Amino acid sequence: GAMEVEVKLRLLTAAAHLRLTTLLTPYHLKTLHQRNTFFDTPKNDLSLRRAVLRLRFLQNAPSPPRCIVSLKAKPTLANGISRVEEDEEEIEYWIGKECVESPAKLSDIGSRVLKRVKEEYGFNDFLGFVCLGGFENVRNVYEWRGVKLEVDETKYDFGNCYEIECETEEPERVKTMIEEFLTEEKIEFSNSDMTKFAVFRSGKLP
Ligand SMILES: [Mn+2]
């Protein structure tokens, strides 16, 4: 895959998130409704090898829903900056849905990314895989001061979490730009130290 580098900051409260979305209103591009689902063996073979296999179902708020398969490998997350190798590929929506119900059916897709999972992690098929479940996220996308901001409201059983992300080749300068703005506007933030999947799997608020 290619390297995804992003600024990743946590917004500390629902009020902070609301204030930020209000402030960013003029810059709004689109709102995405995402359902993230994840797959691994019962022995956590992918996780143990620093890999996450996600099927994301998405819908923009013609607008057909989409399913994107992602393999993310060898992530780092430190000081508000994420770097991870990512491979993504669109698959048919109805096929993705079938796989959530019956993970073995991942074996029946002619997918580039799923072939890469088989080859790189030593599987001949997905008969041994389970669905770990998943969670919903609402992503607001803004075009602001030359960057694309993604503001996330992530819905877990144990509560919601809120983040601001920005994919960029200049993560230090962009992180500074964002932090200065949040500080001036008195919005509560910190570095994000956990991925959404890691929060999900922990079963508790970070
Ligand atoms: Mn992200």
Residue numbers in the entry: -1 to 59, 66 to 210
Source paper text:
The Vtc4p β-tunnel domain is not unique to eukaryotic polyP polymerases but is a structural hallmark of triphosphate tunnel metalloenzymes (TTMs), whose characteristic features are the presence of a topologically closed hydrophilic β-barrel, the preference for triphosphate-containing substrates, and for a divalent metal co-factor (PFAM families CYTH and VTC). Members of the ancient triphosphate tunnel metalloenzyme family can be found in all kingdoms of life. Our comparative analysis defines that most of these enzymes share a common catalytic mechanism in their tunnel centers, yet they have evolved different substrate recognition modes on their tunnel entries.
Instead, AtTTM3 has specific, Mg2+ ion-dependent, short-chain polyphosphatase activity as previously reported. As AtTTM3 efficiently hydrolyzes PPPi in the presence of Mg2+ ions only at neutral or basic pH, we used two crystal forms grown at pH 5.0 (form A) and pH 7.5 (form B) to crystallize substrate-metal complexes under non-hydrolyzable and hydrolyzable conditions, respectively. In both crystal forms, we determined structures of AtTTM3 in the presence of PPPi and either MgCl2 or MnCl2. Here, PPPi coordinates a Mg2+/Mn2+ ion that acts as a bridge between the substrate and the invariant Glu-169AtTTM3. A short soak at pH 7.0 (form B) shows the same arrangement of PPPi and Mn2+ in the active site. In all our structures the catalytic Mg2+ ions can be substituted by Mn2+ ions, for which we calculated phased anomalous difference electron density maps from data collected near the Mn-K edge to confirm their modeled positions. The basic residues in the tunnel center appear to be mainly involved in substrate coordination; however, the invariant Arg-56ygiF (Arg-52AtTTM3) possibly activates the substrate for the nucleophilic attack by forming a hydrogen bond with the oxygen atom connecting the β- and γ-phosphate of the substrate.
